[PDB]
Design a protein around this nucleic acid. Structure first.
Ligand SMILES: [Mg+2]
Ligand SMILES: [Mg+2]
Ligand SMILES: [Mg+2]
Ligand SMILES: [Mg+2]
Ligand SMILES: [Mg+2]
Lengths: 197, 141, 110, 117
RNA sequence: GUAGGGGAGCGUUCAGUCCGCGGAGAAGCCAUACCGGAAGGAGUGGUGGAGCCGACUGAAGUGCGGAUGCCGGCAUGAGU
RNA sequence: CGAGCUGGAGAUACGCUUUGACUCGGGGAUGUCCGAAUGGGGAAACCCACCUCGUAAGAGGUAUCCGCAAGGAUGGGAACUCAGGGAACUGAAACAUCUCAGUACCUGAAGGAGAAGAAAGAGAAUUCGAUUCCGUUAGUAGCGGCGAGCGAACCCGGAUCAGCCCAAUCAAGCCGAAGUGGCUGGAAAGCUACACCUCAGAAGGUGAGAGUCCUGUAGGCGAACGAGAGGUCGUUGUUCGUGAAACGAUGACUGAAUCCGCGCGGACCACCGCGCAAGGCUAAAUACUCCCAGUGACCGAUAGCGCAUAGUACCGUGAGGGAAAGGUGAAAAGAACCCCGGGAGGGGAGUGAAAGAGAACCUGAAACCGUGGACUUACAAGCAGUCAUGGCACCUUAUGCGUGUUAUGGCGUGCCUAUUGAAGCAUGAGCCGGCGACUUAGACCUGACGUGCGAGCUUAAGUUGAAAAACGGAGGCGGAGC
């Protein structure tokens, strides 16, 4: 149901996910994405074992007031962190079809607002950057919106470094997070944008 | 300019019933959780047995499991699905994937049709059902 | 504890250069550089002046009054000036001396 | 991540330690004793709400038979008169009349005496 | 209504997102007679002197009066 | 490299440096005495010698084990590797076979890895084609006081991929684009008005918050010359516990064949099939982290390493054990001078935005100790509150509303634990602050909710891209039971 910007005017293709998008499924997706990215570094000498301390103390009875083994327990100041964090994952495999349904459903959200398909940045000339801003100006890209650029042109990418604007994404290596993270999607390079299955 | 809630990354909702909160042991003061004696911060009294019924019950038995066959029902071939053909590679591709074990045909479906089956064995009333409906069942040497 | 490494024990002036003081009090004021402490990031210019007291009993007469002396700064003075104000540096080559590389900007004089 | 108590306990503690006003000694100064005192105060609080309601009616009744006896009667008798004169259903207010309006109280004594004998 | 089971929520740190605030004064601390059905939350003022609230979602070293609990400070006995 | 340097050092004096100091990168040269310690002794760091060269000073040598000799070995390494030796607590709700476990520990040998390795094999298709590792098969097969419990391998998918020989780019470093005025402020980097750069808006610094002020970043350059056999007895290994126990392995005794020959295929026989022991080497995939870099829903001073640095102080004859401690200010401008005091300490003056930052230097809770004010108390019986009323005081969510306090009346057996039964003369607790207890794991099992596909559903190891996810169908679960 979508047109084009530069290079032609077709678009129209793709049976986009029904009904008027599901936040619940996108939620399931983002969570998984952030869960995978999460590093499992957990600085804790949890065990009464791991902390540096001896093993016997001040006798079982008659010291008058105590009952202690050694200076390493979690009840001791400077002891173990019994139940503290240890290095782990949180990376899991979110069903394939849900990942596929994910970004499709996410693209659908950008259709219901501000979507953008382009055929080459012949409108760019070198890297220059100053000239990407010029091109963006022509297509309502002022800077009032966060923009996501998904091009395969290694030079049109090179003209993306700027502020409250663009995050530049390569070789159709897209993300449901990245597209929801920005206001507009410059879907650009119509390589993944058309033909599959 | 004014204060705005806005839709997107922050408008992403839980999903209702998606995931409830765990059990943190203090719902009022009056939580001195587990039992009240002999249910202790120890590593399990166990959960099976060795008299609690299992022992005190009999058998020397003898376990085997030589060859088990894949049940290829008659109703799969008959009723629906027009003869795409049996052979070996086609029965798999349609829906009867397993490897390691041989196949078997059993008499369940009743629609009557001409079919040529290529199973590794079949029941008396399975062979005497494909032929009666028209067709051959090919069993190897 | 750290100290003046945030740069690279590298300055933008010499113990001779005339420099203008950008930022703070003494803004715009100019002067010759008389002490350059690279690691410490200190500049002794004829700029910021102080009145330092003298704790001097036995130390050459108990007559240890107040002293007129200038107190050091950092990078809170933009080095080298010619078009009346502070500037960066870009054009190097050589003068009569090849081994030396000069400095300059929108103009060409230091 | 680590999540130490910081600020939560001290705030929890100051709340209790402020309900402790004219609390004698440790009961107003140390948390554990201030808090402990309040548990028992809770008993007294909930009980004294429904208790004042017995307390007052008691005071009310006392003033009634005092005046009832001033005009050769008594609470038992007087009330029965007002009850027997179905028309009379003061009950609440009745004590203030005895205490402030003696002229008026007498009228009601005289009415009560009729409905009876 | 005890053990126990079930439900709805308050608060803390960290995180992603959005809306913001701040040396014409942030957090923290201190006072208070205000708000909410409770955990709690706000206004004003005082101190402080450089960072931070709110909303949604995520994750936890997430809530203490007790353990002759641990560390630290300070009391009592006693001007004995 | 291109002007400063004279270590931390907060410190003066003497000096050194464009005939290029300092620092950084790379070589050399000197390296007392101890330590394998090695001339001999020795209670480490000290005693005492001899031999050769020599003007004395001074230099060289003098240990044992290998080998002709060149040349090699002794000793030290956090963890990882193989080897020799090898526990018990514990589980079995007792215990003895069994488990813990060939774990812990000791000992040996070695390296950046080792180990293993080139079929007398796996094994049942007359398939395979060295080893190690990962997924999987699979908690299957099996072992088991058939108890607690223990537990393979083949196939398949994957990382890497070799078979050879004998005996008869990265460190030093340089270059690197682009903002000015007004305003608030002690101070601009903030606010405001117009401006530019962007292959560079990563980051630190600068009196507050930084694209364009410094260091840098993207991008580029870059070094003289610098690294990259069978048997019997005894036993045992693996799922192998005497079982029907094969096979390996070996302490004691024995002891063959030589290719119409030998060994194996889970007693054993025949047939069918797989393979050539009694010689040695062999990279890569694997493991660990003293050290180095990067990163983090890791910590931020009772946390985090024991240490914001200390294996110190302190404790112990010794082995060993073992702390706590952070913060002036933007900059020392670290307070000259005055006053009380021997001093300590303060008060001023001055500096600073602030000294409401003064060196017992950020905030500065609470317990605890005080001074001052309000209301109060010297006929009173008390879990210390609570309700009601009166008196006094006060007016910044706060004048009918209360706030504080106080007299008198009524009522009133701390808290927790444990318990048939707690004020209990039953337990715990001096007080405050902080620290302090239902977690994490597994392709595990079973259930509720939820979502995606749905008679089908799904990937694991890995592979390729990583400001990111796609591929990978080996395998797992429905699908037929008895
Ligand atoms: Mg620790
Ligand atoms: Mg306590
Ligand atoms: Mg602190
Ligand atoms: Mg150390
Ligand atoms: Mg007892």
């Amino acid at each position: 149901a979508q047109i084009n910007v530069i290079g032609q005017n077709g678009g129209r293709t793709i049976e986009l996910p029904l009904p008027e998008v599901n936040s619940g499924v996108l939620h399931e997706v983002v969570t998984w994405q952030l869960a995978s990215r999460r590093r499992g570094t957990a600085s804790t000498r949890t065990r009464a074992q791991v902390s540096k301390t001896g093993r016997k103390m001040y006798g079982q009875k008659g010291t008058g007031n105590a009952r202690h083994g050694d200076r390493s327990v979690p009840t001791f100041v400077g002891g173990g962190v019994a139940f503290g964090p240890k290095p782990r994952s949180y990376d899991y495999t979110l069903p394939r079809q849900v990942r596929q349904l994910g970004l499709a459903m996410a693209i659908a959200s950008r259709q219901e607002g501000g979507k953008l398909v382009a055929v080459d940045g012949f409108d760019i000339a070198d890297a220059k950057t100053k000239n990407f801003i010029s091109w963006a100006k022509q297509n309502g890209l002022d800077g009032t919106e966060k923009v996501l650029l998904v091009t395969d042109d290694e030079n049109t990418r090179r003209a993306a470094r700027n502020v409250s604007w663009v995050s530049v994404l390569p070789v159709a290596g897209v993300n449901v997070y990245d597209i929801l993270r920005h206001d507009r999607l410059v879907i650009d390079a119509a390589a993944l944008e058309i033909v599959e299955e | 300019h004014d204060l705005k809630p806005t839709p997107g990354s922050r408008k992403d909702r839980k999903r209702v019933g998606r995931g409830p909160g765990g059990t943190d042991k203090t719902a009022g003061r009056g939580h001195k959780g587990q039992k009240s004696r002999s249910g202790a911060g120890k590593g399990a009294f166990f959960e099976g047995g060795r008299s609690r019924l299992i022992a005190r019950l009999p058998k020397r038995g003898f376990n085997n499991v030589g060859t088990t066959y894949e049940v290829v029902k008659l109703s799969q071939l008959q009723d629906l699905e027009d003869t795409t053909f049996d052979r070996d590679t086609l029965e798999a591709y349609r829906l009867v994937r397993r490897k390691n074990r041989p196949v078997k045909l059993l008499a369940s479906g009743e629609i009557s049709r001409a079919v040529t089956v290529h199973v590794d064995a079949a029941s008396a009333a399975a062979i005497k059902a494909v032929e009666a409906a028209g067709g051959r069942v090919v069993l190897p040497e | 504890p750290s100290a003046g490494s945030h740069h690279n024990d590298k300055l933008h002036f010499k113990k001779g250069d005339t420099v203008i003081v950008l930022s703070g009090k003494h803004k715009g004021q100019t002067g010759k550089v008389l002490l350059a402490l690279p690691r410490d990031q200190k500049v002794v210019v004829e700029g910021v002046n102080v009145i330092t007291k003298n704790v001097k009993p036995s130390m050459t007469n108990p007559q240890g009054g107040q002293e007129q002396r200038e107190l050091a700064l950092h990078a809170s003075k933009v080095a080298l000036v010619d078009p009346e104000t502070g500037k960066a540096t870009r054009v190097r080559k050589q003068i009569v001396d090849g081994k030396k590389v000069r400095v300059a900007v929108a103009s060409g004089k230091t | 991540p680590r999540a130490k108590t910081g600020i939560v306990r001290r705030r929890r503690h100051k709340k209790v330690l402020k309900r402790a006003k004219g609390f004698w000694g440790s009961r107003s100064k140390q948390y554990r004793n201030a808090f402990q005192t309040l548990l028992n105060a809770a008993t007294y609080e909930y009980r004294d709400r429904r208790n004042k309601k017995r307390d007052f009616r008691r005071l009310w009744i006392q003033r009634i038979n005092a005046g009832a006896r001033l005009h050769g009667m008594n609470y038992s008798t007087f009330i029965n008169g007002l009850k027997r004169a179905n028309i009379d259903l003061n009950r609440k207010v009745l004590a203030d009349i005895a205490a402030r309006e003696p002229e008026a109280f007498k009228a009601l004594v005289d009415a009560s005496r009729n409905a009876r004998q």
